[PDB]
Design a protein around this ligand. Sequence first.
Ligand SMILES: [K+]
Ligand SMILES: [K+]
Ligand SMILES: [K+]
Ligand SMILES: [K+]
Lengths: 82, 82, 82, 82
Amino acid sequence: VPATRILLLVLAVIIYGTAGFHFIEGESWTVSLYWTFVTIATVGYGDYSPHTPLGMYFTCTLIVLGIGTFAVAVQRLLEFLI
Amino acid sequence: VPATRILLLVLAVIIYGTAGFHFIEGESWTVSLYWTFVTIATVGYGDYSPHTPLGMYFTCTLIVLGIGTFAVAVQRLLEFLI
Amino acid sequence: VPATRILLLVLAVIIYGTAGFHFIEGESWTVSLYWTFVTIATVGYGDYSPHTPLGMYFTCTLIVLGIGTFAVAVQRLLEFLI
Amino acid sequence: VPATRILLLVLAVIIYGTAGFHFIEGESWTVSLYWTFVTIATVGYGDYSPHTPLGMYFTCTLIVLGIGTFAVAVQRLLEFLI
Ligand SMILES: [K+]
Ligand SMILES: [K+]
Ligand SMILES: [K+]
Ligand SMILES: [K+]
């Protein structure tokens, strides 16, 4: 898969995660973007997390759709930095 | 290993994690399912965690049985989405 | 590397992590073992963490020595379960 | 990529993470180094995390630049220990 396509896929995941957390959990756009990265990178500080059943369901979908995508994206970035 | 078999294996892990956390730690089915995903994806927010010695032992078993299974499942899902 | 040797290596990591956390941070053997798994699996709930400078240094060493070892161990366990 | 070059790359990431967290979030050099390892290893206890918008942005950059680098570094260390 071409690296630029992988870039677009991870950007789509990031938009999905950010907008979802913002609207479902009510955190700022900035906090939601931060939380999205922390989640899909699997860092998961827990400073932010879903507190609603919908937020929890949404988070599981983001986990499934985002973690693999982010992992592949970082791998490709390695090559272009190294 | 066929992707559908990997699907069944991760579903079995999810049932195991969810039922175990629910019965050992006493959280709702929904919270337990959420916690199971957060754990096997290695996100681990820490908003939920075991507070009993049995829960701690159980969590270690879920970690060992689930993390690899989930990792393989997300990899295969990548291919079917991309 | 033979799977049984990988088993011994991860067991050595587990002993190292458990004894270290117990003596440096003062948590029970059970809690320390649980924390060791949660850490080397990279789950990191944060329900337990080092609160001393020595504990922090020790945790970084466990992270470096343990995360790779655990990752290889789970991969090999996959094959023997599947 | 030569293992020594990978060593230098992860050391550069560690300096970047430590100095950044120290200056942006105001934690001690020791705490900042610890947080850097916990973050790039993806452990993310959440005992420490950014509380400013700049810190959050910085953390996302560290996540993107550091997680892959650390993953490759631990893999190479495995070979030299085993
Ligand atoms: K956490
Ligand atoms: K984590
Ligand atoms: K975590
Ligand atoms: K992780």
